[PDB]
Design an enzyme around this catalytic site. Sequence first.
Site, PDB file in Angstrom:
ATOM      1  N   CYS A 288       0.798  -1.213   0.000  1.00 24.33           N
ATOM      2  CA  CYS A 288       0.000   0.000   0.000  1.00 24.33           C
ATOM      3  C   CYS A 288       0.839   1.276   0.000  1.00 24.33           C
ATOM      4  O   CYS A 288       0.291   2.368   0.171  1.00 24.33           O
ATOM      5  CB  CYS A 288      -0.979   0.023   1.173  1.00 24.33           C
ATOM      6  SG  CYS A 288      -0.339   0.526   2.813  1.00 24.33           S
TER       7      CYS A 288
ATOM      8  N   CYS B  37       5.150   1.593   3.434  1.00 26.22           N
ATOM      9  CA  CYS B  37       6.591   1.438   3.825  1.00 26.22           C
ATOM     10  C   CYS B  37       7.416   2.576   3.325  1.00 26.22           C
ATOM     11  O   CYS B  37       8.357   3.021   3.978  1.00 26.22           O
ATOM     12  CB  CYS B  37       7.202   0.148   3.268  1.00 26.22           C
ATOM     13  SG  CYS B  37       6.847  -1.312   4.198  1.00 26.22           S
TER      14      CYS B  37
ATOM     15  N   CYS C 146       3.476  -7.483   4.933  1.00 23.80           N
ATOM     16  CA  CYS C 146       3.065  -8.159   3.695  1.00 23.80           C
ATOM     17  C   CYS C 146       4.259  -8.929   3.096  1.00 23.80           C
ATOM     18  O   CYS C 146       4.152 -10.121   2.808  1.00 23.80           O
ATOM     19  CB  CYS C 146       2.547  -7.167   2.649  1.00 23.80           C
ATOM     20  SG  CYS C 146       1.090  -6.210   3.140  1.00 23.80           S
TER      21      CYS C 146
ATOM     22  N   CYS D 218       3.122  -2.892  10.014  1.00 25.60           N
ATOM     23  CA  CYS D 218       2.143  -2.508   9.014  1.00 25.60           C
ATOM     24  C   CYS D 218       1.635  -1.109   9.345  1.00 25.60           C
ATOM     25  O   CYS D 218       0.549  -0.935   9.891  1.00 25.60           O
ATOM     26  CB  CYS D 218       1.017  -3.549   9.002  1.00 25.60           C
ATOM     27  SG  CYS D 218      -0.156  -3.342   7.614  1.00 25.60           S
TER      28      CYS D 218
ATOM     29  N   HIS E 267       4.056  -5.895  25.902  1.00 19.77           N
ATOM     30  CA  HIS E 267       3.331  -5.989  27.164  1.00 19.77           C
ATOM     31  C   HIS E 267       4.268  -6.032  28.384  1.00 19.77           C
ATOM     32  O   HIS E 267       4.009  -5.354  29.395  1.00 19.77           O
ATOM     33  CB  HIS E 267       2.461  -7.232  27.046  1.00 19.77           C
ATOM     34  CG  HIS E 267       1.749  -7.636  28.300  1.00 19.77           C
ATOM     35  ND1 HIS E 267       0.638  -6.981  28.778  1.00 19.77           N
ATOM     36  CD2 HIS E 267       1.972  -8.667  29.151  1.00 19.77           C
ATOM     37  CE1 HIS E 267       0.210  -7.581  29.878  1.00 19.77           C
ATOM     38  NE2 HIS E 267       0.999  -8.615  30.115  1.00 19.77           N
TER      39      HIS E 267
ATOM     40  N   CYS F  57       5.218  -2.493  29.007  1.00 19.84           N
ATOM     41  CA  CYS F  57       4.146  -1.511  28.884  1.00 19.84           C
ATOM     42  C   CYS F  57       3.956  -0.686  30.141  1.00 19.84           C
ATOM     43  O   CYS F  57       3.943  -1.225  31.252  1.00 19.84           O
ATOM     44  CB  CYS F  57       2.824  -2.208  28.553  1.00 19.84           C
ATOM     45  SG  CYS F  57       1.452  -1.077  28.265  1.00 19.84           S
TER      46      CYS F  57
ATOM     47  N   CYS G 148      -5.697  -0.591  31.903  1.00 17.09           N
ATOM     48  CA  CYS G 148      -5.108  -1.397  30.846  1.00 17.09           C
ATOM     49  C   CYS G 148      -6.141  -1.581  29.711  1.00 17.09           C
ATOM     50  O   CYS G 148      -7.368  -1.528  29.925  1.00 17.09           O
ATOM     51  CB  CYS G 148      -4.635  -2.734  31.439  1.00 17.09           C
ATOM     52  SG  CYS G 148      -4.381  -4.117  30.297  1.00 17.09           S
TER      53      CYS G 148
ATOM     54  N   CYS H 236      -6.277  -5.103  23.174  1.00 14.55           N
ATOM     55  CA  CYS H 236      -4.846  -4.916  23.038  1.00 14.55           C
ATOM     56  C   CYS H 236      -4.100  -6.238  22.882  1.00 14.55           C
ATOM     57  O   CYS H 236      -4.237  -7.148  23.727  1.00 14.55           O
ATOM     58  CB  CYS H 236      -4.282  -4.190  24.258  1.00 14.55           C
ATOM     59  SG  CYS H 236      -2.555  -3.754  24.085  1.00 14.55           S
TER      60      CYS H 236
ATOM     61  N   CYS I  47       7.822  -0.283  20.263  1.00 20.51           N
ATOM     62  CA  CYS I  47       6.984   0.922  20.202  1.00 20.51           C
ATOM     63  C   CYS I  47       6.801   1.647  21.537  1.00 20.51           C
ATOM     64  O   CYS I  47       6.565   2.850  21.579  1.00 20.51           O
ATOM     65  CB  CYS I  47       5.607   0.514  19.688  1.00 20.51           C
ATOM     66  SG  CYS I  47       5.740  -0.333  18.074  1.00 20.51           S
TER      67      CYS I  47
ATOM     68  N   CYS J 234       0.372   3.319  19.658  1.00 25.85           N
ATOM     69  CA  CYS J 234      -0.925   2.670  19.554  1.00 25.85           C
ATOM     70  C   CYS J 234      -1.580   2.378  20.898  1.00 25.85           C
ATOM     71  O   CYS J 234      -2.792   2.539  21.042  1.00 25.85           O
ATOM     72  CB  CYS J 234      -0.776   1.382  18.762  1.00 25.85           C
ATOM     73  SG  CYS J 234       0.059   1.660  17.191  1.00 25.85           S
TER      74      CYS J 234
ATOM     75  N   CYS K 205      -2.823  -1.908  20.772  1.00 27.90           N
ATOM     76  CA  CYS K 205      -1.916  -2.574  19.840  1.00 27.90           C
ATOM     77  C   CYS K 205      -2.685  -3.664  19.067  1.00 27.90           C
ATOM     78  O   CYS K 205      -3.450  -4.407  19.683  1.00 27.90           O
ATOM     79  CB  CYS K 205      -0.733  -3.186  20.611  1.00 27.90           C
ATOM     80  SG  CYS K 205       0.390  -4.219  19.614  1.00 27.90           S
TER      81      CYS K 205
ATOM     82  N   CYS L  88       0.826  -5.734  14.736  1.00 30.37           N
ATOM     83  CA  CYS L  88       1.064  -5.575  13.295  1.00 30.37           C
ATOM     84  C   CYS L  88       2.398  -6.095  12.801  1.00 30.37           C
ATOM     85  O   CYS L  88       2.565  -6.270  11.608  1.00 30.37           O
ATOM     86  CB  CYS L  88       0.909  -4.091  12.884  1.00 30.37           C
ATOM     87  SG  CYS L  88       2.256  -2.973  13.289  1.00 30.37           S
TER      88      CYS L  88
HETATM   89  S1  SF4 Z   1      -2.337  -1.997  27.612  1.00 28.49           S
HETATM   90 FE1  SF4 Z   1      -1.844  -3.855  26.306  1.00 28.49          FE
HETATM   91  S2  SF4 Z   1       0.410  -4.128  26.380  1.00 28.49           S
HETATM   92 FE2  SF4 Z   1      -0.189  -2.687  28.092  1.00 28.49          FE
HETATM   93  S3  SF4 Z   1      -0.429  -3.949  29.963  1.00 28.49           S
HETATM   94 FE3  SF4 Z   1      -2.491  -3.813  29.000  1.00 28.49          FE
HETATM   95  S4  SF4 Z   1      -2.632  -5.611  27.550  1.00 28.49           S
HETATM   96 FE4  SF4 Z   1      -0.434  -5.346  28.126  1.00 28.49          FE
HETATM   97  S1  SF4 Z   2       0.084  -2.139  16.387  1.00 30.23           S
HETATM   98 FE1  SF4 Z   2       1.455  -2.736  18.153  1.00 30.23          FE
HETATM   99  S2  SF4 Z   2       3.355  -3.492  17.123  1.00 30.23           S
HETATM  100 FE2  SF4 Z   2       2.187  -2.315  15.527  1.00 30.23          FE
HETATM  101  S3  SF4 Z   2       3.045  -0.230  15.676  1.00 30.23           S
HETATM  102 FE3  SF4 Z   2       1.261  -0.255  17.051  1.00 30.23          FE
HETATM  103  S4  SF4 Z   2       2.099  -0.768  19.121  1.00 30.23           S
HETATM  104 FE4  SF4 Z   2       3.699  -1.261  17.599  1.00 30.23          FE
END
Ligand code: SF4
Ligand code: SF4
Lengths: 481, 277
Positions: free
Chosen positions: B12, B15, B115, B153, B202, B205, B226, B232, B241, B253, B259, B262
Amino acid sequence: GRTTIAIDPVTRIEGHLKAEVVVENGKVVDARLSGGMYRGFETILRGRDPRDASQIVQRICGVCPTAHSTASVLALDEAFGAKVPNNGRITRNLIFGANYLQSHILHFYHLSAQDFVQGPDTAPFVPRFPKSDLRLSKELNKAGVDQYIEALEVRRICHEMVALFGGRMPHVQGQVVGGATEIPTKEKLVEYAARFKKVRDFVEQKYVPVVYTIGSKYKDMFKVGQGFKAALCVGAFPLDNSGKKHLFMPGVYAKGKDMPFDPSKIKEYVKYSWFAEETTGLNYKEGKTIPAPDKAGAYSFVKAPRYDGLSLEVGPLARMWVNNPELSPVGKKLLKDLFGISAKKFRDLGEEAAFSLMGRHVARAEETYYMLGAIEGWLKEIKAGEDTVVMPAVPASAEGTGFTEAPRGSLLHYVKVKDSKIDNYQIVSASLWNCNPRDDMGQRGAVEEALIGIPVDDIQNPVNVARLIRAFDPXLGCAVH
Amino acid sequence: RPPVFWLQGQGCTGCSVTLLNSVHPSIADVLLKVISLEFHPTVMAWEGEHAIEHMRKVAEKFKGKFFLVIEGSVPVEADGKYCIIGEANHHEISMVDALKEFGPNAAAVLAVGTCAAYGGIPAAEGSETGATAVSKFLGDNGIKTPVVNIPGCPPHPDWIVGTVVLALDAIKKNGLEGGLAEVVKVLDSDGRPTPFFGRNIHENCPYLDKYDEGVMSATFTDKVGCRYDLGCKGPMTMADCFERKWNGGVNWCVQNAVCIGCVEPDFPDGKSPFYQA
Ligand code: SF4
Ligand code: SF4
Ligand code: FCO
Ligand SMILES: [Cl-]
Ligand SMILES: [Fe+2]
Ligand code: NI
């Protein structure tokens, strides 16, 4: 007497496009556009939780993903019965509006400007056609190079603006059914506005002036590329919570007449497209996507959308023509000083010059300026801390249609939900309206028709074929999906 | 200064766009001094068969020495017809044929994006094009050229630029062949460089304390809890990230929404539904 010229890949566009033209007596006399890559999102989507669509569809196109995000969440809002909170409506406009700025700047500088500006002797700026028809003075050519470089920064800042409330870019996380996932804070609004001021200054001081100034050296390019002189706008950027007032209002313009937009008049034809014959002529609510890559006579993975039988174009020219806003102060002044034209509103350019190769670049610059005003307004309207989302349940059975304007033109997504899953999902996108092949009756697509009459005085350096195409800012990822 | 050819299959262009967003201090030098971006259809000057022939002449001159960046999946159904990338004097070149031509002669291939790395959305349930990951396609066709996967992605620009830097340093230190051998050692089992993909989201996080306390947000706009109940996929995702964040560090994200995993080989189907655990 006739020479056929094939160009594959057409470069400095998004995606996979072949153009084939016939040239006779120094002009294009026939054209065919082929979208050469297919993924099949409309079938990939089936069977999924409908909420997944607002992520999946963005991967149609990493240049305009916020448009697909928008269309998708609007379709989902309808299907789910979700009432987007006021502050969420405005937040969405801030997320998406920022990518209009990104996209138009990317297009003019990073995709189009090399059509008129000679780059330095280093890849990827060389090699190129020996007679590229690059007319600018030493000084103006240098301004083009300097601004291309500056624009790399500016377009990046635009994506920072998108990400502030959108999560990341490409592919925002921040738009969902029911609104926007992150309430703007005072501190992040300051961050967005600081960046926006930098972008505004570039648009006003560099971009708008350079398009007119370069245009004034290519006045011949306002005399070609008219095609059908027919345009579509489906509306975008809601300005209230009752679905009526929008930054761009819907309308159709054809044969010199303005008429309302009725989406029931859309049909997608496939005779010249690589899809099963029995799927021809469907409105999107009954759309089907059955690939047929070996079908005789077809030449594109782009379907052929027609509006009440008409082949129409979309994009900044379409929107600015249909809505006819006042021109930018810098545009009015340069029209006077460089072109001898007194103009107040966009249609004062006249139909012939507006619907032209250079007219389309001018419309896109004018629209970028127009969008600055809208974003300024939204930055005053937004309220820090006010909730931006509701959390609706997934319906077992529903349908919805989301209409918006991507930076390149009209976009709609239609979803039908059965057993709480996507039963059908149909996309009718901007570069589909522009870069489609003939319909079943032999009527060309908008860009195919706009190619007719394009000058090719030198078959060894046929630079105007792709210049015309680039004026429409194609992205074939969108067109085919 | 080795040439780079950037070929896109079923992608797409995300990248390319993500790379345009790089604030990496080294990116300008990568493009202007270290390598030469000789073919890239989104941004190059020339067009059509001339652009294809330019790439072929360069590839011939630098046989064994040029680098391929491959974005998008490679569709094998219908004899490659679902992705045509160019035409040379009436002869169409599918993505299948392009990789069979250039792949054997590259020093290495960077498969950028989920991809190209793993098949991604074009290979997901409901697809019909035979979308294939780059490493799988090359292997299936007896092409042994080294491939590094840089998924996402889209990927973060730092993952792309950072992998290039890793490679540059390795090749300076041990030469082309030996350099690539050192890069292999820091790839995980999914071909991803461990500096960027070696940590779980995670586990790192900022909301892990809330996860452990069982404090879950019920609406996206509640930024205290959370995001697990909102869908997530951080627990199943290997990316950094949480640290570098996105778009000049302005967001990411998990802060913004959830999240969606991706960067993972099962994206999207194994990470879907996105908005349920
Ligand atoms: S927000 Fe997502 S990555 Fe962060 S503690 Fe909760 S489940 Fe885990
Ligand atoms: S979807 Fe998850 S792995 Fe992909 S860029 Fe966002 S936080 Fe990072
Ligand atoms: N802009 C954009 Fe994408 C296209 N064409 C959509 O819709
Ligand atoms: Cl967009
Ligand atoms: Fe479609
Ligand atoms: Ni697009």
